[PDB]
Symmetry: D3
Subunit: 167 residues, 6 copies
């Protein structure tokens, strides 16, 4: 029933390797900001750990084990504190980090909101069984991105993936 205070703690998982992916993340935060059921949102790429012993760090480059552990754990920490996951899932370039986080969250029995995006709304609709069955709620990013602003994250109502070929 109606909550006394916002309780949703969103773990916003998302690729961040292209302008389009980056714009979706931006857009997602905005909508989430308009949702009255949200108490907090964590985006893994917002802050960052800095390793002093790490001289001249580069992206996609070799990183120190210390930076790697700290950054990975901040993400797991985000998942731990989150009550649910929201994944801006690029269906054109499958992100394994996101897929990994979806499985982790489900192993913890946490609800997972999948928001698929494709630049080819007209190509075949197929999805991996693990993703298709692991997620508890699907919200198409192409045509319903906006309900993130209204979805009741206090209870995360289920909505099984349907309409996708399974492989």
């Amino acid at each position: 029933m109606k909550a006394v205070v916002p309780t949703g703690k969103i773990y916003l998982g998302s690729p961040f390797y292209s302008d389009a992916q980056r714009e979706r993340a931006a857009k997602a935060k905005e909508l989430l900001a308009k949702n009255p059921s949200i108490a907090h949102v964590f985006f893994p790429f917002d802050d960052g750990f800095t390793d002093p012993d790490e001289k001249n760090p580069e992206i996609g480059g070799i990183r120190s084990m210390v930076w790697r552990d700290a950054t990975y754990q901040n993400d797991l920490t985000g998942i731990s504190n989150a009550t649910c996951g929201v994944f801006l899932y690029d269906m054109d370039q499958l992100d394994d980090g996101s897929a990994f986080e979806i499985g982790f969250m489900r192993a913890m029995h946490k609800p997972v909101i999948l928001v698929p995006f494709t630049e080819h709304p007209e190509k075949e609709k197929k999805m991996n069984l693990m993703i298709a069955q692991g997620v508890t709620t699907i919200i198409d990013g192409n045509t319903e991105f906006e309900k993130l602003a209204d979805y009741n994250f206090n209870e995360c109502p289920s909505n099984p993936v349907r309409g996708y070929g399974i492989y």
Copy 2:
């Protein structure tokens, strides 16, 4: 220390959408068969559930919810009974089902053996942080596929991913 009987229960995760992926799986089973530390190996694509109410089933096609649940659960069942995971991980075509299973297994604190394969041993070596940090042991598929036959699955000795750019 030395085990009285084999105790390793391997969950062999792997894409199965190309001849090359299919040959690796085949090869993997053979090596695993030669390993004295293995009590059992589960390959998700070996058996299969059959839904009677499912008329004319097709691969990649729309599947019944009953078949979807049963098949997904057989996989989770495999992960549950497994003591460790071994992933024939295609680095050229990232498989999200596999990535999902890697995260699930790690959320359960189970050791995960990553065996990466690439048809371009000469291209840049980069890996997602979640995969790079989530796996506990890496065995290159291109140059060490064969140690699967000797690895001590009774204890799954760690071997951190190194030599890969992190993104």
Copy 3:
């Protein structure tokens, strides 16, 4: 130990088959509604609609509806910080029991609120329930405690006075 804000997130599980059971549920919602340590309450029966289900209650239900409804409850269990169970000692609801075992396997606290209309029978309880529950509040004589119980910390209160089977 004094919360800055209410944190208690209650999963209120109970059978919803008889009028009596529907009454208890009705009362609990109100009682918990007056507790200042509660941030939110979730009640399973407050549902999903399979647009493809041509559907009777108690009848054969589509797998899609079954999956979504079952998940909505587990999701309520996941979000909850504790469980409050309007537990029927006369008609044992295995669903409620399942959920109690699920929550405990998750290490979360479970407040057992038993009810009986047969005070005549020897008060007894299954071991798993007797030992699994962390806090018991008699529904026949302490129901009102739910409006005052501190769900921010859910103080323990082991089951006693019940014969074990």
Copy 4:
């Protein structure tokens, strides 16, 4: 794949006390003892903890906290060690202990096999959604009780509950 040594570790859950129920349990053991895939079977009612500090143990009595604690724990230990659960489920007199155990195992992602028994096959077939959905494989006690001797507990293939009204 074929197991090198039996892998199934069964948690055999069942109500006792009722003459019929005891019979079921006894026959289940026999059936299981004949299954090559089973490595071990734990039945909670077999042996028990004796509280030396317990005067006159009343079976159904107001038993001491030490006995209760040790007995309850001996069951969780069995659930913990078990790879799968097999429940002799009485559809005539619902045993909440069993139900408890089923959800506990499912929260652990362990496979659960339901073997329902009814002395009233003429009565309506109904099942609580939590059981019907939580269970991973059903094997009708009244009709396929014998299957327990052939079921491959090394993989516990799933068989979704069906044909039951759901309330």
Copy 5:
């Protein structure tokens, strides 16, 4: 991102009995009470369970099973409700209770903040690997105790233990 309402639910673990230790705990509370990101703080020694059936409660005595059970459980409940753990860790007299609690929380994937205190800053700096690796963020009690008032418990950014010998 910025939280809409305090999200941090702290499990404040610490040894008691020792005059110094009590002081630490008292100051930690003050510091925490000043942190805007904190929603609630649970300290195991604050209030307690009273076993009406317990004659003359001996603090350090052979306490009854009911008291023990209710007290131990009240702590797990706090760990369960908590989003993160903050441990006032005595490097001079290792408290195994605290250690227990740290591993329990890590098995749950919850973030753990170590605040080490030593009355002998001249002695060698060493730490048991399990603590040094299990801990997700360290905040020197002797030097940065005040940080507890600024630390964003809505996300618990990590800070790997370093500068300690490991045995």
Copy 6:
């Protein structure tokens, strides 16, 4: 209940700093070696080598070595069906305690095998240890029980006779 094959998978945790501690560990391995209910035993100190570490015991260790070694233990905890702890009551090993809490959060059984060289002091134990452990075998007077204990089912034996703090 009679295993077809040994299933017990033991995670043997203990401090490995003093000669005495190194002796107990030595004995346990042998005792467990005679138990027919055991399929395998894992002992943390039996290690990893960071080819890039130029390394002293107790010294500063590379993060890579730290990560791999720590993981090897958690992996041993994951594979194990139960834990056997050669627990020192004179010099509390927080590593062992951490691992005990980890295993219990995983619902696995933990056999506490305490040892003391000071029978003179009031036998006491921390609550979390006293309540977390599921089976206790006195290392000073029952050490040998480990060769006969049934690890296929690890029968419970709550801690008693210890004052609680």
